Amino acid sequence: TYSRQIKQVEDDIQQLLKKINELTGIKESDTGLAPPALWDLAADKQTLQSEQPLQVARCTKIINADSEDPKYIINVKQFAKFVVDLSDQVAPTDIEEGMRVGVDRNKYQIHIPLPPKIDPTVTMMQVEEKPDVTYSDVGGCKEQIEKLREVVETPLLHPERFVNLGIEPPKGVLLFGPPGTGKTLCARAVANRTDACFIRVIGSELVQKYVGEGARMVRELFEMARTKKACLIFFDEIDAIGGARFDDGAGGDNEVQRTMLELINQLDGFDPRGNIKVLMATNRPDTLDPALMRPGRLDRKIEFSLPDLEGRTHIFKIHARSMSVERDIRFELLARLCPNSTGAEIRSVCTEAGMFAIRARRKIATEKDFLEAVNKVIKSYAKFSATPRYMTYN
Amino acid sequence: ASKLPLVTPHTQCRLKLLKLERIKDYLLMEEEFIRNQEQMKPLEEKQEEERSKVDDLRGTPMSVGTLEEIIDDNHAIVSTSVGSEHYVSILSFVDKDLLEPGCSVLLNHKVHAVIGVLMDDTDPLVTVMKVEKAPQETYADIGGLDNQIQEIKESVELPLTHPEYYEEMGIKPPKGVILYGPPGTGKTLLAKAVANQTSATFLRVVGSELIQKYLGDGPKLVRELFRVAEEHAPSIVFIDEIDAIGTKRYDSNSGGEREIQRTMLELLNQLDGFDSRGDVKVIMATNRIETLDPALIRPGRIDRKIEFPLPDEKTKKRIFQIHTSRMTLADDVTLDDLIMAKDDLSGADIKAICTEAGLMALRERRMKVTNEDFKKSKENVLYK
Amino acid sequence: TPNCRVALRNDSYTLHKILPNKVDPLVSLMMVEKVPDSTYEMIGGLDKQIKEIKEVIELPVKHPELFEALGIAQPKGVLLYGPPGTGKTLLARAVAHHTDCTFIRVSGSELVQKFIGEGARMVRELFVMAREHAPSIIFMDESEVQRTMLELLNQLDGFEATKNIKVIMATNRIDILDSALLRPGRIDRKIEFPPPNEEARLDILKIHSRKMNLTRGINLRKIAELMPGASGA
Amino acid sequence: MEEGGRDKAPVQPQQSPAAAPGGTDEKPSGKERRDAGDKDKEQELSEEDKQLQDELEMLVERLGEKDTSLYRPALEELRRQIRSSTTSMTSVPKPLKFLRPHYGKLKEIYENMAPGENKRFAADIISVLAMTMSGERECLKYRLVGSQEELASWGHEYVRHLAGEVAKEWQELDDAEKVQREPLLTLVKEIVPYNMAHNAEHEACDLLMEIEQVDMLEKDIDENAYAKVCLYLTSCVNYVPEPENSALLRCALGVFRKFSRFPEALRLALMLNDMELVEDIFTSCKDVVVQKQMAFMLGRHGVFLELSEDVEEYEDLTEIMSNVQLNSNFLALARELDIMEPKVPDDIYKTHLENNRFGGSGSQVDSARMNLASSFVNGFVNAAFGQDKLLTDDGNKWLYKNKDHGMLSAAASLGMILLWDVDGGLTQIDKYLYSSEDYIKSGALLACGIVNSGVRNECDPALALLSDYVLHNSNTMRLGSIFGLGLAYAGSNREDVLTLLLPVMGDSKSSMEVAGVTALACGMIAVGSCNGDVTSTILQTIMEKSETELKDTYARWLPLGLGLNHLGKGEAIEAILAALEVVSEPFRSFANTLVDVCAYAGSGNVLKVQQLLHICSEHFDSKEKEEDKDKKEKKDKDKKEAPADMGAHQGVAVLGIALIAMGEEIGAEMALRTFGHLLRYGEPTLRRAVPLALALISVSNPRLNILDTLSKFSHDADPEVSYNSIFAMGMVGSGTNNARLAAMLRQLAQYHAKDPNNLFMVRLAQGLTHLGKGTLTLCPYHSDRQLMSQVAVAGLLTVLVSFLDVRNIILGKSHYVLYGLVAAMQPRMLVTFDEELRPLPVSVRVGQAVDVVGQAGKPKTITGFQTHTTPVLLAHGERAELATEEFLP
Ligand SMILES: Nc1ncnc2c1ncn2[C@@H]1O[C@H](COP(=O)(O)OP(=O)(O)OP(=O)(O)O)[C@@H](O)[C@H]1O
Ligand SMILES: Nc1ncnc2c1ncn2[C@@H]1O[C@H](COP(=O)(O)OP(=O)(O)OP(=O)(O)O)[C@@H](O)[C@H]1O
Ligand SMILES: Nc1ncnc2c1ncn2[C@@H]1O[C@H](COP(=O)(O)OP(=O)(O)O)[C@@H](O)[C@H]1O
Ligand SMILES: [Mg+2]
Ligand SMILES: [Mg+2]
């Protein structure tokens, strides 16, 4: 009824919000500047306080000390080397050799030790954040879930039942099967439930242009692994990181083999890694080198096969619990119609048959809509099917 | 800016009056609230006194730095342009959230302390493969197919335009879409139609140019590619001719097939990574569908498989009707004789015969196209 | 302006003055390559091929509307073929020289590389300089050339809106290139270059015999018969 | 340009109305038959809403407007039929014949005469006939008439029936979504006196439709979520009889007339309590309506069900009182022990593990104030039947060591361990009560008042805490004996023990740590009447607060219980009653805003808010009334939790620009508690904006303001992924932000969200706009956190057990008589529907479907399937009886 009276009372304050917030100051879309009233701690004090008593303290690297005297041999990025001194702010204890320290620009003396260098693309692959996959969603392979879980988390969540028995639990485990079987999806639940550093590694991220370049990434990776108390290291598609050694004539594929041998040395012998747990995942496990296949690195060897009948029905109950359906259908008929099938294929059946409900104008799918999914996904897409040479893994 | 997203009465109501009247009171309260500050305390003006004081802090030479670590009490190790890195402190007008490892900042000239960050410039790779505008005409240009058009709108367009149908259903859209058939059947043409249709960001890359001459630059290019595709919005990633990564070998590749393989491994990760993917759609096309790795083809990574047949003759006459629409056609010609000239001709062949016939018209400067233009036009196009 | 040299003071780095412009990287590129610039006046007896290439390239610049008079799309791809030494480079240089287009060949070299970019992970980064010299023509010699041309034609099949950008490939023995390149919806016109006959050797003797200090009475017809038609070189 | 040819309507309506002054006089047939030809042709050629560009309605008034102005007024012999041919033609195009000053001259065509039965030519047409014109009547015409001319002539008397029949035309044409225009006609009509138009459309709404009750019923309470004092006073008591007179849905009475309880009349919800006790059907809906009367939004009802039919249905009152409270116990007796909860989870202190090797060594923090937080390893994790047998040794060996308020604290944690209990909570205290200690007996008997929270059976009317009170000549025997009785009997309205606690205020004892929380204890009991409590407060306030100029022991404790005793009404009398009561010097006029705005918790009266921040904006205040302006912002912390997303964005968008951004003391010291009184849940728009001012501690201020916002920021329940944002701040909190004043504070912050794996619904929003108190149990701690002198000595009474109105968690409850059903539910997001197509799409979060007692969450709306039909209460209320019916084969 009051067409202008609602409209101008709307509009004058929808503009006047800007007309007073300009008077406050949120404007001048920056080039890298703060909100104008957040830096007010450094309005006056830290302008002449974080700058005028403070200095650059350029960071360096220790070569070695000497006896009887400090006389520290220092090193910098490009420039020369010096024989430097402490400050009074430090004891000479934690000024150990091969260490980064912060050093003033004029006297060239040492202020504070630093954490060492970490290569940045190794820092990127720390996960920092967790997915949402719950162990309810990996239904069908419960014995594999338990046999994995007893290695992964039980010494971490309970480091007393193994100690008071007097056993060292296994530290290595690989996971393998056909594609789409639930390996990576099974790992996402591990990343869900876990609490420590879950450092993921995909093997194709380690192929580098320079010679031996990836091996140093492996080294620094296990360095920051050894910095933490407990840590989980995830490996995916390790056929790229190594098959075997087969060189002949023109020696090819060597650069992968050097990084793989470095991974071997970082896994076993000569300062063992301690509380670091690894986890591999491949598609075809036959190509792998047997020294990598040696236990002590790859203890648990979990098979992933297709579910028998009941695991398949359970997968139907997982992917099919959350969609508007006819109530009185049965899934066991569908699991009879899918002898050899993965949970990905079953998910494509459910998510396809919902689209069969969206075909004409229905809101709840039917059993014959499921039948229209089965012949298409199984039998019409049955030309490709992706499975059988991966059943023999060749 | 983001002040009241509640617009749901959508009428002349006392609610929509009072929403503003309340916010009218709050914001007049903020006006006369701050009005005492510039009348009572003009010591700091806060429009140019504090900002000019920041500009008095920062020097006029503003050196550009590089981030590699963060220590939280506003000092960090930052890299110089030469490489001789420092351990400077960070100021407080520095908006402590954009700072990531590898980011570029602004340093002091004197003590090299972190003045601010810099919103870094783009385009090394983004505007190479980002599609600028709508390429061509609409789905009415296609004709004759009419079924897989519903399939592609089904998997791609409808989840965008109607995000209610899947939520009333309890379902997510199918992930992967692949195209295959004989060459010249309109695989790229349908992608032009979708690129006309959509509103999301659209990315296109040939499957040939995935390969590199340096080792690992392939999979690195893959990782930064899906980085770029993820970081913007709900986009559409198009890949044409992905057989060519498997068919041809090039001597610029210092690696053999066991580097192409590793590129396909990293790509195989980037379709179905354990990471949260996001609103990214994948559309693929080839003609040798039998050659490539089926682990890429499995449901879960590619859901919908779409065959393109050769056109039937009633679709062929429709395609003749399309490509002979806006041309001055003399009545000498009969399209039906032109239909059965080749038993398995394509729309590209039809368009080639039409355009080459127009070239035969322009050789003789004419405007209409005669029959013998088509008679020698099929001789030029077809047989050699 | 972006990408311009300036003068700069040193104490406070205040911007002093704008200096002269940087040389264009395309100009430095062609200065590196040094194609033999040519004209119609040094063509020996190829006039029907001239009439073909005028129809292909000369028309969709000076008369783009003339294709809208017929309702057909404009051609984009040219394949020249014939034995080497038969005028391919001078012809393709000459056409752009007369229609005033930026003759930009590509070789896949790496001295050229620093002017395209630091790596130029595609060929497609060339298109910035191409549409920056928008009435331009791309030239190619004789498998990386063959994939590169496919990467060009997949862009300018409708994915690039800027016109007046055309590509030209020259080779011999047309049957040994790609069948996907031999898809009939791809190549717009293919032009054969034959070896010269006794007529078409005499005029190359005429044009080429211009800069020499001759003697009166030469009878180039006899010498043109003495050469049994190898090529123009 | 296709003109001419078909010009019949720009020619014959151009000629015959032009020949009408030449055919009015001396042509009596041409006056009327051409006017009838101008009535049926403009009528029938103007009914269709497809050709809205009519051929006369924007065509004839090039000459027919001056012809109308020289036709109706300038004729002066307008008879009884030619007004029906004249004013039925000249009234149809007149909102578009005239320009925008039509509003004062709709009457110069219509009020000459309304022609006959005006809806006869407004039958087919929707809103271009007169509904827009009637909007021009009720917009300006009935505003100028009904400003001070309500009881009047034709400008009201016919306007009631005209605005009645138009409103029947809205629910007569289509039954579209134009039904909600009837609140926009009945409400725009006589804005303040809404009752007289609600008389004109309430019985028409009774005869309107039964299906068209719910969306306009939601539209009316949508218009009643926030309103002016008289329109919320009027449209809500008009909103009450709609599912009582017209509809028989009748189970949404008590939870939605708690809306209509306080500002209208305190006896109105008692007459609606009678309306509960009259519809005596069976027991399902009768049961479920009276379920909420004990521990879901109110108390003070347990003397009203002792009628003459005490067998089982009027013996429901004992079951309401303690047996469904015992079902709230049964949530943790069965339904929490079955899912996850062991007797000692205990491992968040074990989650504090990794700082020994994260950068150096450990075994360094050995402060005795760490043990104050280490008693909450016992205290916080053990709520909801987390009972402990010799697992209270962290409170046992610290109970006999030092820290007298820690001897109160470890003895007071047992009440937080045994919550909602009457069965053995008095027996678990006595094993550690007998210690002969002023602090152990007072904290333990203080916990006795905590265990019986919500019971109000025979535990302590004058039994235990009165015996704790009568020992007094000293410390917390005097103090902690009045706290638990106002705590447990805070939901009670009993006057007798209020007059046992009235000589505590009337003592005028110098123990001001007792006399201050006396107002906080008696304020929690009463919210309405008994002005003698307010007299007892103001008399000691004049005897003690006047002859001094000292600390906020007075200011934080004494007027706050007066705001409790005058909470919740919009009438603006109580501000006159208490603001003119202690008219005084400004340190005693600290209580200006207390009773003023404590009456105004959730409403819309933002004119109060401009007279709440225009008086003292900054004034530069050289240490003068920074506490009064911090309290002036403390009373900005209402109005924002429930205007249904109206002021929350306008508090994060105004206070983050105003006070913590551009202030000196209010923002730097205090103005973050709006995010601790506004919310308890959490969204990242401020959840990732407060650690910009927290993780930057900026110790240049009195840094225990920022450390006060550490644990307070952590005030948010419903536990989250915030262990990074808190454990990082305790990781830098190991070295920095020292443990000498904060070792209780960082682990107090960490343990606060996830004490248990449930019990957090404390947000004063259980369902929708539900109040459910707390506004008495939650407020005095946020008023108590002034700045200091209470982190060590005095505030250890309130920092443990301040808020204890935790009405549990869940809504997934069967409550069958046998209790055999589990559920058939489907949890989703909060709804978005206001008006849409048919089955209004409710919400969009279909991806979750359970059938068990699982988690609730804040923005959740839950429905079902199976044709269970859920016919009990149908909206919200978390104790659905869950009957079923199968008239759907
Ligand atoms: N037990 C299961 N229950 C439900 N879904 C499953 C199960 N196993 C597999 N899936 C489905 O299969 C899909 C693929 O999972 P995942 O990525 O782990 O396959 P994979 O075994 O790692 O093989 P690939 O290495 O090819 O991915 C997942 O999206 C998941 O939904
Ligand atoms: N069904 C059709 N209707 C109309 N035009 C068509 C059709 N099929 C092909 N064309 C024409 O053929 C040309 C080539 O189309 P397109 O390149 O998309 O086919 P393609 O199968 O993608 O070929 P390639 O196998 O080389 O990728 C298009 O320009 C289009 O005009
Ligand atoms: N028709 C011709 N007229 C004159 N000179 C020619 C002709 N054909 C080739 N040449 C000579 O051949 C050389 C260029 O070879 P060309 O055929 O253009 O490139 P390519 O041999 O790489 O295809 C020039 O030096 C030119 O003098
Ligand atoms: Mg996988
Ligand atoms: Mg194609």
UniProtKB/Swiss-Prot annotation, chain A:
Modification sites for N6-acetyllysine: 77, 383
SMART domains in the cross-refs: AAA
Keywords on record: Acetylation, ATP-binding, Cytoplasm, Nucleotide-binding, Phosphoprotein, Proteasome, Ubl conjugation
Record GO biological process: osteoblast differentiation; positive regulation of proteasomal protein catabolic process; proteasome-mediated ubiquitin-dependent protein catabolic process; ubiquitin-dependent protein catabolic process
PROSITE patterns in alphabetical order: AAA
Annotated compartments: Cytoplasm
Annotated function: Component of the 26S proteasome, a multiprotein complex involved in the ATP-dependent degradation of ubiquitinated proteins. This complex plays a key role in the maintenance of protein homeostasis by removing misfolded or damaged proteins, which could impair cellular functions, and by removing proteins whose functions are no longer required. Therefore, the proteasome participates in numerous cellular processes, including cell cycle progression, apoptosis, or DNA damage repair.
Protein name as it appears in the record: 26S proteasome regulatory subunit 7
InterPro entries in the cross-refs: 26S_Proteasome_ATPase, AAA+_ATPase, AAA_lid_3, ATPase_AAA_core, ATPase_AAA_CS, NA-bd_OB-fold, P-loop_NTPase, PRS7-like_OB
Modifications the protein undergoes after translation, according to the UniProt entry: Monoubiquitinated by RNF181. Phosphorylated. Dephosphorylated by UBLCP1 which impairs PSMC2 ATPase activity and disrupts 26S proteasome assembly.
Any one GO molecular function term: proteasome-activating activity
Induction behaviour: Expression is not cell cycle-dependent and occurs throughout the cell cycle.
Positions that bind ATP: 177-184
Chief localisation class: cytoplasm
Superkingdom as given in the UniProt entry: Eukaryota
Swiss-Prot record, chain B:
InterPro entries reported in the protein's UniProt record: 26S_Proteasome_ATPase, AAA+_ATPase, AAA_lid_3, ATPase_AAA_core, ATPase_AAA_CS, NA-bd_OB-fold, P-loop_NTPase, Prot_ATP_ID_OB_2nd
Binding site for ATP: 181-188
Membrane topology: Lipid-anchor
Residues that span the membrane, as ranges: none
Compartment annotation: Cytoplasm; Nucleus; Membrane
Designated name of the protein: 26S proteasome regulatory subunit 4
Keywords: Acetylation, ATP-binding, Cytoplasm, Deafness, Intellectual disability, Isopeptide bond, Lipoprotein, Membrane, Myristate, Nucleotide-binding, Nucleus, Phosphoprotein, Proteasome, Ubl conjugation
Curated annotation (Swiss-Prot), chain C:
Gene Ontology CC, one term: nucleoplasm
Localization: Cytoplasm; Nucleus
Gene Ontology molecular function, alphabetical: ATP binding; ATP hydrolysis activity; DNA-binding transcription factor binding; general transcription initiation factor binding; proteasome-activating activity; TBP-class protein binding; thyrotropin-releasing hormone receptor binding; transcription factor binding
Binding site residues for ATP: 82-89
Record flagged with keyword Cell membrane: no
Entry keyword annotation includes Nucleus: yes
Top-level division of the source organism's lineage: Eukaryota
Physiological role: Component of the 26S proteasome, a multiprotein complex involved in the ATP-dependent degradation of ubiquitinated proteins. This complex plays a key role in the maintenance of protein homeostasis by removing misfolded or damaged proteins, which could impair cellular functions, and by removing proteins whose functions are no longer required. Therefore, the proteasome participates in numerous cellular processes, including cell cycle progression, apoptosis, or DNA damage repair.
Primary localization class, coarse: cytoplasm
Residue numbers of N6-acetyllysine PTMs: 114
Phosphoserine: modified positions: 12
Family classification: Belongs to the AAA ATPase family.
GO terms classed as biological process: negative regulation of DNA-templated transcription; negative regulation of programmed cell death; positive regulation of DNA-templated transcription; positive regulation of inclusion body assembly; positive regulation of proteasomal protein catabolic process; proteasome-mediated ubiquitin-dependent protein catabolic process; regulation of transcription by RNA polymerase II
Descriptive protein name: 26S proteasome regulatory subunit 8
Swiss-Prot record, chain D:
Regions annotated as coiled coil: none
Key words, A-Z: Acetylation, Phosphoprotein, Proteasome, Repeat
Modified-residue entries (Phosphoserine), positions: 16, 29, 147, 361, 363
Tissue: Found in skeletal muscle, liver, heart, brain, kidney, pancreas, lung and placenta.
PC repeat residue numbers: 409-442, 443-479, 480-514, 517-551, 560-589, 692-723, 742-757
Residues bearing PTM N-acetylmethionine: 1
Sequence segments annotated as region (Disordered): 1-52, 623-645
Ranges of Low complexity composition bias in the record: 10-21
Keyword Repeat: yes
Disulphide bonds in the chain: none
Required for interaction with UBLCP1: annotated span: 708-889
InterPro entries reported in the protein's UniProt record: 26S_Psome_Rpn1 (IPR016643), ARM-like (IPR011989), ARM-type_fold (IPR016024), Proteasome/cyclosome_rpt (IPR002015), RPN1_C (IPR041433), RPN1_N (IPR040892)
List of residues that carry Phosphothreonine: 24
GO annotation terms (biological process): proteasome-mediated ubiquitin-dependent protein catabolic process; regulation of protein catabolic process
Basic and acidic residues bias spans: 24-52, 623-643
Domain of life: Eukaryota
Protein name (record): 26S proteasome non-ATPase regulatory subunit 2
Organism of provenance: Homo sapiens
